[PDB]
Design a protein around this ligand. Structure first.
Ligand SMILES: Cc1cc2nc3c(=O)[nH]c(=O)nc-3n(C[C@H](O)[C@H](O)[C@H](O)COP(=O)(O)OP(=O)(O)OC[C@H]3O[C@@H](n4cnc5c(N)ncnc54)[C@H](O)[C@@H]3O)c2cc1C
Ligand SMILES: *[C@@H]1O[C@H](CO)[C@@H](O[C@@H]2O[C@H](CO)[C@@H](O)[C@H](O)[C@H]2NC(C)=O)[C@H](O)[C@H]1NC(C)=O
Ligand SMILES: *[C@@H]1O[C@H](CO)[C@@H](O)[C@H](O)[C@H]1NC(C)=O
Ligand SMILES: *[C@@H]1O[C@H](CO)[C@@H](O)[C@H](O)[C@H]1NC(C)=O
Ligand SMILES: *[C@@H]1O[C@H](CO)[C@@H](O)[C@H](O)[C@H]1NC(C)=O
Ligand SMILES: *[C@@H]1O[C@H](CO)[C@@H](O)[C@H](O)[C@H]1NC(C)=O
Ligand SMILES: *[C@H]1O[C@H](CO)[C@@H](O)[C@H](O)[C@H]1NC(C)=O
Length: 515
């Protein structure tokens, strides 16, 4: 991509769910207009009639989702039930967010773009067409990814990472590789956010209908079981149904949280569990909503004596055991929800730099369960079980030690408040790295007590547990699942790139079958 305005041309075929027919018929129904849903929708409409169903509204309604500068704003904004950010708390007690908007989490994220680690393909076991994977990345990148310009704070952390030993220097690259690099962004060089919603512009406007403020509450089934259609409600509280045509399919792309939720409500999940809630079992499947993962975030905040310019994350320090990045920010009197793990967290009075490490995997996991057994608009229960696996914890320790090395660099020295020898010359917001304390146990305590969400949560409808190699729900015809719920491990440090590619890639697979 180059600099241009967010392209809203697709609005010519976006309708409020209140204005759709009571009973619809399409070749394809895509539930959830997010990261995978949008390009899958657009792709299938090249040839067939597609209905895309999104519970949120359109991003024009929320202007702060449209700029690089607006990132904190949407997180700070209070959740009223219609806003683009939906707040929740895991049962672990860590604050967290998901999207509720057309374009999905790409409309609210930090804009970091990367391709999957090339070892990911062989690790899964799926026979990926790697040529086509690449062409599909190229298609996303041409539409919404730029090579970012220089930002001074990112250039400092760039020199710090090299100095601290995060080698080699990869230059500018979109590939997930060991070492330091400038990567891509879906924020353009004029501050404008580009997102999955713009990929709708690649669709055929006479094949694709997008319905917004559509809350999909049930998948509909025949009595050789098949998905036949969906029930959705509109903003007026009225019910609508939509059915698939011969050889067409329902695709669930409701995300890590919404997919298991929808499947469970539709009677696809653990049998004795669904029976305890008086839901009719259509397909017993023990793994619907199991193996849900959230990569932990651990961080420090430095307050420099001189002001620093605000920046979006573009520069990455990759090792096999920890993925590091940094953001610099203006001060605020209102906390951006889930930037810090709870609400009782000190407020910065000046510019600060948020310096962050991510645990790969992770190995720890929990579940998504129903809270309401009938209402999709009531959030499900989610538990991540942060640091129940000891390999996760060790990896956090390693990452935190690397952050110490980063803070000892000459590159970071001018941002110290006091010119002493140690890292206590920095002023901090919140908890410093264990001060003077060298041994592993101090880091472990730091990791466990100050963990945040990295927001890259995945799983709950896994390939191999619920899905086959082609993303079909096992035992059920004409049903697929395509979003972040499909994999038990991260494809790289920043997964939007992979899930954008996956929306289209699965679409092309489907279109090849129809040939
Ligand atoms: C604050 C934040 C910052 C992040 N920063 C980055 C980053 O910088 N780079 C990066 O690569 N990744 C980042 N990520 C992670 C990445 O954005 C997500 O993993 C990815 O976007 C998820 O895609 P998805 O298709 O699974 O879900 P989504 O894109 O959320 O798609 C789900 C869509 O389904 C809709 N939906 C849910 N239930 C229903 C229903 N019942 N009926 C109809 N619609 C429904 C939702 O409203 C949503 O629009 C970030 C995530 C967050 C939350
Ligand atoms: C550069 O960025 C500005 C925002 O700083 C963009 O201005 C917006 O673009 C469209 C016009 O196409 C308007 O509908 C919005 O009202 C504008 N927003 C703001 C905040 O002013 C501008 O389009 C960008 N320029 C280019 C060429 O991409
Ligand atoms: C796909 O792209 C990567 C760069 O991202 C490259 O190194 C690899 O060889 C490509 N694979 C194919 C099959 O073209
Ligand atoms: C941007 O990148 C590097 C420093 O990070 C340098 O080679 C180059 O001069 C910079 N370009 C501009 C236009 O400032
Ligand atoms: C890429 O993936 C492989 C296989 O999952 C993993 O062992 C390796 O560490 C990854 N590389 C990086 C740099 O994260
Ligand atoms: C639903 O959520 C609340 C916390 O938000 C929890 O205390 C309650 O037990 C949940 N209900 C069910 C049925 O799990
Ligand atoms: C998690 O790590 C491995 C890999 O899944 C697993 O076999 C083990 O049971 C877990 N470790 C701990 C300490 O529970």
């Amino acid at each position: 991509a180059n600099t241009s305005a967010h392209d809203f041309s697709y609005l010519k075929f976006v309708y409020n769910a209140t204005d759709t027919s009571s009973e619809g018929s399409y070749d394809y129904i895509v539930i959830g207009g997010g990261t995978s849903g949008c390009p899958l929708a657009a792709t299938l409409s090249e040839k067939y009639k597609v209905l895309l169903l999104e519970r949120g509204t359109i991003a024009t309604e929320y202007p702060n989702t449209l700029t690089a500068d607006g990132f904190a704003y949407n997180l700070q904004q209070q959740d009223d039930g219609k806003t683009p950010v939906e707040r929740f708390v895991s049962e672990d007690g860590i604050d967290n967010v998901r999207a509720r908007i057309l374009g999905g989490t790409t409309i609210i994220n930090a804009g970091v773009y990367a391709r999957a680690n090339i070892s990911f393909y062989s690790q899964t076991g799926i026979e990926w067409d790697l040529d086509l994977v690449n062409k599909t990345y190229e298609w996303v990148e041409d539409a919404i990814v730029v090579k970012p310009n220089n930002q001074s704070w990112q250039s400092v952390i760039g020199e710090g990472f090299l100095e601290a030993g995060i080698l080699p220097d990869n230059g500018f690259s979109l590939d997930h590789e060991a070492g330091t690099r400038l990567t891509g962004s879906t924020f353009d060089n004029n501050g404008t956010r580009h997102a999955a919603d713009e990929l709708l512009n690649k669709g055929d406007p006479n094949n694709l209908l997008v319905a917004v403020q559509a809350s999909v509450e049930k998948i509909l089934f025949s009595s050789n079981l098949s998905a036949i259609g969906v029930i959705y409600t509109d903003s007026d509280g009225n019910s609508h149904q939509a059915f698939v045509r011969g050889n067409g399919e329902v695709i669930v792309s409701a995300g890590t949280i919404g997919t298991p939720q929808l499947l469970l409500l539709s009677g696809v999940g653990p049998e004795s569990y669904l029976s305890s809630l008086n839901i009719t079992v259509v397909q017993p499947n023990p793994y619907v909503g199991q193996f849900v993962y959230d990569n932990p975030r651990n961080f420090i905040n430095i307050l420099p004596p001189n002001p620093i310019e605000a920046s979006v994350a573009t520069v990455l320090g990759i090792r096999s055991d920890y993925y590091q990045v940094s953001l610099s920010s203006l001060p605020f009197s209102t906390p951006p929800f889930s930037l810090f793990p709870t609400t009782s967290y000190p407020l910065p009075n000046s510019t600060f730099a948020h310096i962050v490490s991510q645990v790969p995997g992770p190995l720890s996991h929990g579940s998504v369960t129903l809270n309401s057994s009938s209402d999709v608009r009531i959030a499900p229960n989610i538990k991540f079980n942060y640091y129940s696996n000891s390999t996760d914890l060790a990896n956090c320790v390693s990452g935190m030690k690397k952050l110490g090395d980063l803070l000892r660099t000459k590159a970071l020295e001018p941002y110290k408040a006091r010119d002493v020898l140690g890292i206590d010359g920095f002023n901090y917001l919140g908890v410093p790295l264990p001060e003077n304390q060298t041994d592993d146990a101090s880091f472990e305590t730091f990791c466990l007590d100050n963990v945040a969400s990295y927001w890259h949560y995945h799983g709950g409808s896994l390939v191999g547990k619920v899905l086959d190699d082609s993303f079909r729900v096992m035992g059920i015809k004409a049903l697929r699942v395509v979003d972040a719920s499909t994999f038990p491990y991260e494809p790289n440090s920043h997964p939007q790139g992979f899930y954008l590619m996956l929306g289209r890639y699965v679409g092309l697979q489907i279109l090849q079958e129809r040939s």
